[PDB]
């Protein structure tokens, strides 16, 4: 937050806590909006043998 130090202390005293520790506006700490491709594994019934549907 681009808040001056005097205003920082004033708001800290008014609320009675430390606010810069936990801010309610998102900043660079969030994840990127572009992400690498995933892989998404398969389920247990993706076998090539011993996988008859009558048993599941």
């Amino acid at each position: 937050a681009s808040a001056t130090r005097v205003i920082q202390l004033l708001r800290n005293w008014a609320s009675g806590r430390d606010l810069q520790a936990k801010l309610q506006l998102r900043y660079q700490e969030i994840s990127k909006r572009t992400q690498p491709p995933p892989k998404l594994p398969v389920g247990p019934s993706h076998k090539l043998s011993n996988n008859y549907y009558c048993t599941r």
């Binding site: 076998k47 090539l48 043998s49 011993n50």
Partner: protein, 215 residues
């Protein structure tokens, strides 16, 4: 069969007891044997029914090329019978019951031998290709499944498959076997089953060689 018809007049003339005096019980008589493949002297010979396989081969075919220790596998009863390795052929008798006990079956008593210098996978794939080209296509299991197994074995020969496909091919053979109109499907599924059962390490090693060489 031609042989069954041809032996009947002699059976009538000499009596059934004389013909039954040969071989074991439930396996009586004499048989015509065709030895081909990797023997010094491939030939057709008539011999007592329950003859040992090795004794037959050595006395009539002149032995296996390169010696008996050079033997790799034997197809005892034509392409429809599953193969057996040298250990089974050491003390196996050539009749219906003993060859069934070896999980093979006598079949037509056509002995095809293979030494250690030949590709067992390639020969089995050639047999499967023969069955693919000879199926009449009437019923879906034989037609589609045999085409499928032909493709799978063609991929197996090069090693282009993964090890998990061996059990898939076994299950495909199980699906074909016992579900067709005639026994051609069984006679195509059995060689694959025998090849898998007796040479799974060979297929796996071929696949891993392909995997390393292609990365």
């Amino acid at each position: 069969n031609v042989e069954t018809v041809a032996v009947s007049p002699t059976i009538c003339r000499r009596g059934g007891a004389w013909f039954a005096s040969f071989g074991r019980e439930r396996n009586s008589g004499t048989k015509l044997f065709n030895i081909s493949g990797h023997v010094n002297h491939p030939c057709t010979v008539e011999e007592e029914m329950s003859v040992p396989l090795k004794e037959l081969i050595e006395k009539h075919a002149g032995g296996v090329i390169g010696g008996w220790d050079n033997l790799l596998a034997v197809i005892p009863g034509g392409s429809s019978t599953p193969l057996i390795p040298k250990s089974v052929c050491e003390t196996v008798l050539m009749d219906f019951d003993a060859l069934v006990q070896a999980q093979t079956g006598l079949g037509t008593a056509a002995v095809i031998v293979m030494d250690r210098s030949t590709d067992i996978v390639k020969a089995i794939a050639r047999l499967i290709e023969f069955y693919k080209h000879e199926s009449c296509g009437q019923c879906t299991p034989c037609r589609e499944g045999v085409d499928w197994m032909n493709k799978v074995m063609a991929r197996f020969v090069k090693g282009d498959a993964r090890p998990a496909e061996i059990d898939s091919l076994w299950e495909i053979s199980k699906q074909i076997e016992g579900h067709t109109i005639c026994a051609l499907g069984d006679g195509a599924a059995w060689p694959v089953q025998g090849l898998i059962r007796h040479f799974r390490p060979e297929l796996e090693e071929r696949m891993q060689q392909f995997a390393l060489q292609h990365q």
